[PDB]
Amino acid sequence: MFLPPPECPVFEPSWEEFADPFAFIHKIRPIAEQTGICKVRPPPDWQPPFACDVDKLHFTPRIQRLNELEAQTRRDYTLRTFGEMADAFKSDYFNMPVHMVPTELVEKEFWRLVSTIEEDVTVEYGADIASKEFGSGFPVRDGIKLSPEEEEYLDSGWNLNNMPVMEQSVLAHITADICGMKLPWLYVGMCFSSFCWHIEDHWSYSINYLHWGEPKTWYGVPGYAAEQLENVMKKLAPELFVSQPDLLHQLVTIMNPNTLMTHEVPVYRTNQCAGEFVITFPRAYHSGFNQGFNFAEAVNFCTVDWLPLGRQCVEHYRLLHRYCVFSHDEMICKMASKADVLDVVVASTVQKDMAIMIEDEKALRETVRKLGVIDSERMDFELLPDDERQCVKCKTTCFMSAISCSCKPGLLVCLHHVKELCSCPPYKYKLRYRYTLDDLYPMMNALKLRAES
Ligand SMILES: CC(C)c1c(-c2cnn(C3CCN(C(=O)CCl)CC3)c2)[nH]c2c(C#N)cnn2c1=O
Ligand SMILES: [Mn+2]
Ligand SMILES: [Mn+2]
Ligand SMILES: [Zn+2]
Incomplete structure (x- = not known):
């Protein structure tokens, strides 16, 4: 029946x-x-x-x-x-x-x-x-x-x-x-x-x-x-x-x-x-x-x-160690870089997601500095093939930042999994980052100007 x-x-x-x-x-x-x-x-x-x-x-x-x-x-x-x-x-x-x-x-x-x-x-x-x-x-x-x-x-x-x-x-x-x-x-x-x-x-x-x-x-x-x-x-x-x-x-x-x-x-x-x-x-x-x-x-x-749910989804993928199809943060930053041509309601909504992104990233970077990661260098993550920028532990596609170590060339962890990269002490690690905090705030301001008009 x-x-x-x-x-x-x-x-x-x-x-x-x-x-x-x-x-x-x-x-x-x-x-x-x-x-x-x-x-x-x-x-x-x-x-x-x-x-x-x-x-x-x-x-x-x-x-x-x-x-x-x-x-x-x-x-x-x-x-x-x-x-x-x-x-x-x-x-x-x-x-x-x-x-x-x-x-x-x-x-x-x-x-x-x-x-x-x-x-x-x-x-x-x-x-x-x-x-x-x-x-x-x-x-x-x-x-x-x-x-x-x-x-x-x-x-x-x-x-x-x-x-x-x-x-x-x-x-x-x-x-x-x-x-x-x-x-x-x-x-x-x-x-x-x-x-x-x-x-x-x-x-x-x-x-x-x-x-x-x-x-x-x-x-x-x-x-x-x-x-x-x-x-x-x-x-x-x-x-x-x-x-x-x-x-x-x-x-x-x-x-x-x-x-x-x-x-x-x-x-x-x-x-x-x-x-x-x-x-x-x-x-x-x-x-x-x-x-x-x-x-x-x-x-x-x-x-x-959908934008906030998209951010929630990538977090849920991290918990499950599931692969991403694309980087959510990369898409947000791409849109921010094109703020002058965005629909104004789009610009307003992207601005809100970006504010959350920036605050989360600030807290993550403070945590890894306290773990003894001191060296850093800018890295253009969007140029790497996806299978070359997934976290060793949770498989997330990195874009805002990752940790590398010369002990294990080519491997990356996201900032949630600093302890999962290799056996070397963290002063041998490097923070690789796409933007400094000071690059990010003007990007979010371009979106606000576009939205407020
Ligand atoms: C029976 C067929 C004709 C059929 C299928 C279908 C069957 N197998 N697949 C695969 C292809 C490979 N694949 C990916 O690449 C992931 Cl993106 C996974 C899914 C799709 N899906 C749907 C929907 C929906 N939603 C609506 N109608 N419909 C169909 O009639
Ligand atoms: Mn049967
Ligand atoms: Mn479907
Ligand atoms: Zn990870």
């Missing part, structure tokens, strides 16, 4: 409300952050055109066994041959035509199937960022001639290629090519292909658009219940919490939302249909599965609302 969770909120913005995605997300935030996910139906005439040759789009499939609580890690088809496989799979599974399989029946059967070890069902799917094959489902510029209808959507705020580089996004002016977090992912689904329970890197927002095909079923949990959900999963499946040696080595799993609900974790559901958006909020866990053959596109993003 499966008892469906309550439905998440659904928003139907007017064209006036829809025009600015960041203003809209800020508006609905008081409601949607209580449920973790929400659905957005665009105005009825906002319809971006979909244009693809099913025979020239190629991708390498991933394969998936469907067993609840089993760990999963974080050939070649055209879109036509995948679709033919996917449709045959589903109509053979149910001995029905595909449009007559009720979505409630697919959902019921999915949770039966994953809990029965007597069933050995495996499925395939596509998941990758855009390239030369495959390509965004939204219109992009390229010197093809576009139709006027495609040109209408080139600069839309809801074209997921544009959303990151808009001015109310803070991941905008970052220049460390991250790939994973400014570029959309493309998802080609089939019946029962599923995404395991997760949150996004650095606790970012995400936005997902279903271009066409059968629906995508979602489960979501509010940010406030994140640690509650994790404690439930630790009890029931401890193997997933053994620390792994790379950010490409993470373990995730399928888990029945009724189990979370039995342990008093709030869970919401929705069926996302073609032409609709789903938005996930910072630190909101989510999972789901595809009802049939379909095609979706998604991207991470970060608003000014």
